[PDB]
């Protein structure tokens, strides 16, 4: 059994953010409750509302219920979040989350299963995808026979960004740095992979860079300076 | 907030800690249906305790629930590096709502101090071009997690340019952070040798890159 969040990382504000979950591994119209949880900077989770996979019976949120929609579709598997007239305060990362229950009013239900999480960020600024630059490799700071190399992701805004290698065949050693942020409203961000220096220039080395929020894809070679 | 938690906790390594969640009578006190939640940093909450004291196969012994009236608790035993995380217990409230506490965010005191490693890297070529120039050094592998980074020109001081990560935990429980100089290329190739000091626990590390 899996969820899956998708949705833009990026909504205006006064305007509608729209989440979808894809459940996989069990059907959506079976005995549970399918949950919205966000978790704004900071603050804690908060539970947003449910759909009854039977029955399709909403419950809401108190303080949110005049500003939430969940729908769920039995086709395609999936159920959906809607929140209006957003605001910085909604900022958030978006899980959705499975409910498993016995008998409600003796014991409630919990969340066994979550999807991963969805960065949903609420700023008027527009879309701007990374620039990617090498980070030629460097043998002073590993153990001997090996050295350092890496991709500078470069001024990108929203977050987040994903780095693999090699296609995620390459996973041994790998280290992606927390984002910084700069005054100029972007974001940048290193990954970094020690490899042995014998295959420098007999192995090829590429980062996969994952830009969702701006829907930009890099596959970016790092070379030794010539 | 609603379900009221504390702050944060501190333990040592080994020792048990006790996280408090205090609800209601239309909460926790109306149910056998409090929840904790496990949340590390980049992953989604992991379920611990549910139904207030069961534990879902693959939850550790370590952890147990209990309630008593309107609080509900969680302990964990022998403490480990691995346990520092946000806590979270919640509960499905009385008409058909669901409510969480605000968080608790676990401290494990005790690790083996770890000095960084550092990396620095020089502009790429292709920057360069652009007529900017971004110095990137990497801080890996250092505990307590508290660094302070200081960049030179020629032995001179920078101020300006610079942008500093706070430190985050690493799989292996050390701690990672990075800072970044923004230059011109100008800038970059004016200066015979650009310095990354790293200073951790009295101790600093000083690597230089050269155009």
């Known amino acids: 059994v899996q969820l899956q969040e998708s949705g833009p990382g990026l909504v205006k504000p006064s305007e509608t953010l729209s989440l979808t979950c894809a459940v996989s591994?069990?059907?959506?119209?079976?005995?549970?409750?399918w949950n919205w949880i966000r978790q704004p900077p900071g603050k804690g989770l908060e539970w947003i509302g449910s759909?009854?996979?039977?029955?399709?019976?909403?419950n809401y949120n108190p303080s949110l219920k005049n500003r939430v929609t969940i729908s769920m579709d039995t086709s395609k598997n999936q159920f959906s979040l809607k929140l209006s007239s957003v605001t910085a305060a909604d900022t958030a990362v978006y899980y959705c989350?499975?409910?498993?229950?016995?008998?409600?009013?003796?014991?409630?239900?919990?969340?066994?299963?979550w999807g991963q999480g969805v960065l949903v960020t609420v700023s008027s600024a527009s879309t701007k995808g990374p620039s990617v630059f090498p980070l030629a490799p460097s043998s002073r700071s590993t153990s001997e026979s090996t050295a350092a190399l890496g991709c500078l992701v470069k001024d990108y805004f929203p977050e987040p960004v994903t780095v693999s290698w090699n296609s995620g065949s390459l996973t041994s050693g790998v280290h992606t740095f927390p984002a910084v942020l700069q005054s100029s409203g972007l974001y940048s961000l290193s990954s970094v992979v020690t490899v042995p220096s014998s295959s420098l220039g007999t192995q090829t080395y590429v980062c996969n860079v994952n830009h969702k929020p701006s829907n930009t894809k890099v596959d970016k070679r790092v070379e030794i300076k010539t | 907030s609603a379900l009221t938690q504390p702050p944060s906790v501190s333990k040592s390594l080994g020792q048990s800690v006790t996280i408090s969640c205090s609800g209601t009578?239309?909460?926790?006190?109306?149910?056998?249906?409090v929840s904790w939640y496990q949340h590390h940093s980049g992953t989604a909450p992991r379920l611990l305790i549910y139904?207030?004291?069961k534990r879902p196969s693959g939850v550790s012994d370590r952890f147990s629930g209990s309630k008593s009236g309107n609080t509900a608790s969680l302990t964990i035993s022998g403490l480990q590096a691995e346990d520092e995380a946000d806590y979270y217990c919640?509960?499905?409230?009385?008409?058909?709502?669901?409510?969480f506490g605000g968080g608790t965010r676990l401290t494990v005191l005790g690790q083996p101090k770890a000095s960084p490693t550092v990396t620095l890297f020089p502009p790429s070529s292709e920057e360069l071009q652009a007529n900017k120039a971004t110095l990137v050094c990497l801080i890996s592998d250092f505990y307590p997690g508290v660094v302070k980074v200081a960049w030179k020109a020629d032995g001179s001081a920078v101020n300006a340019g610079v942008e500093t990560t706070t430190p985050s935990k690493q799989s292996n429980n050390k701690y990672a952070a990075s800072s970044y100089l923004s230059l011109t290329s100008d800038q970059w190739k004016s200066h015979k040798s650009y310095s990354c000091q790293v200073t951790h626990e009295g101790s600093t590390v000083e690597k230089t890159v050269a155009p």
């Open positions: 989350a499975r409910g498993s229950y016995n008998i409600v009013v003796l014991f409630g239900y919990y969340f066994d299963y």
């Open positions: 591994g069990g059907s959506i119209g079976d005995d549970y409750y």
């Open positions: 759909i009854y996979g039977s029955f399709g019976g909403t």
């Open positions: 009578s239309s909460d926790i006190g109306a149910y056998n249906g």
């Open positions: 139904e207030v004291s």
């Open positions: 919640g509960s499905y409230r009385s008409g058909s709502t669901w409510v």
